[PDB]
């Protein structure tokens, strides 16, 4: 439950206009100082400008020159437009944000070795099948670890994973797709936008060296060609909801998706404190 976007507060307004607005601050500060030349200070001017651009929060003292008022007013117009556009863009980005599955695939760090991570990345599969044999030979250690959480039924495994006792499942693609598409809602998803590993297929086993294989294969290919199989799929192997760019919702704005602003604030505060301490020796000298 939730969406992942740690850069939401910086995703809009890419870092190309911030430098432009900064150099604008310096250039208008210089021109305002020049105009006022013919108790003024550049510090008061830059403080007033920076406070004005950010919703006029800082209670700064205003100048008195008549020509300065026009510049202040046009800057206020620019700041109002800036803030309105930024709020609209942030809302647009927040509405259209998407989600990505936590695990990229079977060959991943979260699956290769769970001992050196958070509390164990629990998973499992039903034994006595092709999936167990496929898993065992390629990755022996995963089969060694996984042999602790083994169910005895697809429905039981789905029920257990629904309540949070399990967090992953590995099984055949067709039955998993059908279960995902025909459950109470589709709060269940398959990692990857329709991802399949070791794609083999299904078939009709026949006795060895028989005389029926040619006719059966030709009949099956005729069924495929004649168009009498797509309707079969629609009738017997269809679902309700589609897992394609859902982006349901998110809320509560937890610190995981916003820690960047506090990290930047702490870094800036530390830098300012360090430079303030450093300036003391220069002042004394």
């Amino acid at each position: 439950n939730g969406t992942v976007s740690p850069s939401a507060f910086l995703e809009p307004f890419s870092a190309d206009v911030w430098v432009m607005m900064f150099v604008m601050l310096l250039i208008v500060s210089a021109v305002a100082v020049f105009v006022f030349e013919y108790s003024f200070t550049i510090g008061k001017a830059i403080w007033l400008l920076w406070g004005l651009v950010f919703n006029n929060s800082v209670p700064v003292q205003n100048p008195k020159g008549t020509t300065s008022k026009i510049m202040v007013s046009v800057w206020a117009f620019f700041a109002v437009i800036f803030l309105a556009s930024y709020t609209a863009n942030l809302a647009a980005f927040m509405i259209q944000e998407e989600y990505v599955d936590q695990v990229s695939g079977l060959s991943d760090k979260k699956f290769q070795r769970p001992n050196d991570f958070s509390p164990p990345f629990r998973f499992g599969t039903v034994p006595n099948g092709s999936t167990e044999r496929n898993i065992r030979n390629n990755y022996a250690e995963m089969h060694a670890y996984m042999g602790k959480f083994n169910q005895r039924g697809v429905d039981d495994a789905l029920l257990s994973l629904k309540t949070g006792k399990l967090d992953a499942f590995i099984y055949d693609a067709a039955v998993l797709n059908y279960m995902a598409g025909r459950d109470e809602g589709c709060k269940l998803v398959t990692i990857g936008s329709g991802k399949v590993f070791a794609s083999t297929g299904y078939g009709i086993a026949i006795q060895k060296d028989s005389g029926w294989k040619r006719q059966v294969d030709l009949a099956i290919l005729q069924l495929f060609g004649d168009g009498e199989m797509e309707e079969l799929e629609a009738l017997w192997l269809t679902g309700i909801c589609h897992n394609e760019k859902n982006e349901v919702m998110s809320s509560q704005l937890d610190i995981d998706n916003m820690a960047g602003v506090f990290y930047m604030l702490g870094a800036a505060m530390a830098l300012s404190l360090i430079t303030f301490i450093s300036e003391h020796l220069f002042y004394w000298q």
């Binding site: 939401a8 507060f9 510090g43 403080w47 920076w50 406070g51 950010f54 919703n55 929060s57 800082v58 209670p59 803030l83 930024y86 709020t87 942030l90 809302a91 927040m94 509405i95 025909r182 009738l235 269809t238 679902g239 309700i240 909801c241 982006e247 349901v248 919702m249 809320s251 509560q252 704005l253 937890d254 610190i255 916003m258 602003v261 506090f262 604030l265 800036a268 505060m269 300012s272 404190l273 430079t275 303030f276 300036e279 003391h280």
Partner: protein, 127 residues
């Protein structure tokens, strides 16, 4: 108060506000606690109260970053509240007779009709 937010964030932002006030007060005293705290609070909720001002350039930097932080907080809160008022529940519903929920319902979907009517013949007369 806390629908588009979490309580932990509220406590964290309060602690950060007080820590910033303490830091500015210490910086001012080293080279005005009430002035610092009132300035920080007035910046946070965008209120005209408070006439205090900083002196050192470093305090100017903290004031600027504080204003930026307050602006970004307010903008993010407004945007997220707006985003929650449009994206509702998907609320899936039956499309008609071709919805797979009607063909093979096991136990959690019972649909009936009026006995001995014109619709029963329609279903009975199709294999």
């Amino acid at each position: 108060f806390m629908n588009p937010f979490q309580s932990t964030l509220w406590l964290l932002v309060g602690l950060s506000v007080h820590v910033v006030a303490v830091m500015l007060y210490l910086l001012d005293r080293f080279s005005t606690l009430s002035s610092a705290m009132w300035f920080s609070w007035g910046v946070l909720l965008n209120s005209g109260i408070g006439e205090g001002a900083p002196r050192s350039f470093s305090a100017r930097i903290l004031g600027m970053v504080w204003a930026g932080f307050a602006m970004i907080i307010v903008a993010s809160y407004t945007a997220n509240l707006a985003a929650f008022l449009v994206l509702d529940r998907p609320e899936e519903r039956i499309t008609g007779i071709n919805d797979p929920r009607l063909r093979n319902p096991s136990d959690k979907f019972i649909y009936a009709t009026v006995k001995q009517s014109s619709v029963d013949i329609y279903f009975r007369r199709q294999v």
